[model samples]
Target: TPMRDVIALLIQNPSYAELVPDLASVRHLMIPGLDTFSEVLEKCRQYPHITTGQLLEHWRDSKNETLLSRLASWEIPLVEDNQEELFLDSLDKILAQCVEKQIENLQAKERSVGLSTEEKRELQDLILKGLK
Candidate 1:
């Protein structure tokens, strides 16, 4: 898989070799639908060469919603107790936008690939109602 290839490449790089000692652990954290968001983030942080910005950018570009959802799910604990409600509201806003973007992508695909009319209409209605 692309992640495996990337991990191999990173491990092979002389500059990154020292920082990423346990490639297997890193690979485990990178595995889709497997590692928790906190685990992934903590593992990523072990490599000092990787910046938070780079990690965020990589997460944003990837279409792995499961991983992203895990990250979102962590928002509750990540914020201060007194600020929990505000963090939840922010998380809701971000997740809603993410869902909207996914629906728009699906709608575009449906138009181009010819979804069954019923399927297309049902999806369209669901998107309109903001129902995941």
Candidate 2:
């Protein structure tokens, strides 16, 4: 659900759409699947199996769409469905999905699941960061 968190970030700030991959601080957020900041932007274009369109298209710096030609594609639920109807239908959609996921994640913390307090704190922090 890391991609979900990232998607929700783009949703939170409409003006940020064109600048994500262009900005170092936000570029890493665009490639959450990666481990470091180095080459994150390059890898964003190579997200063959998993990607979110809202985040990836920002990286699409192309002439006659040069980046689009080099861009990798996808398979299924592995990638965040970034279609206009799927994700862009309503601006609130990302946050709502995030809330629902957090609820599920919270349920996973019940006695039956038993995540430690430290783990819960990290989870809560991650969720809060996304919500805002």
Q: Where does candidate 1 stray beyond 4 Å? A: 1-81, 117-122
lDDT of 1 by residue, 10-91 (tens): 3222133333223231223223422333344344555547643354455555665444434433423343344433433443
lDDT value, candidate 2, whole model: 0.41
Worst 10 residues of 2 by lDDT: 67-76
Error of 1 at 59 (Å): 16
Q: Pick the candidate with the highest lDDT.
A: 1
lDDT of 2 by residue, 58-132 (tens): 545534233232232322245444643443333244444445555466657764678888767756665666443
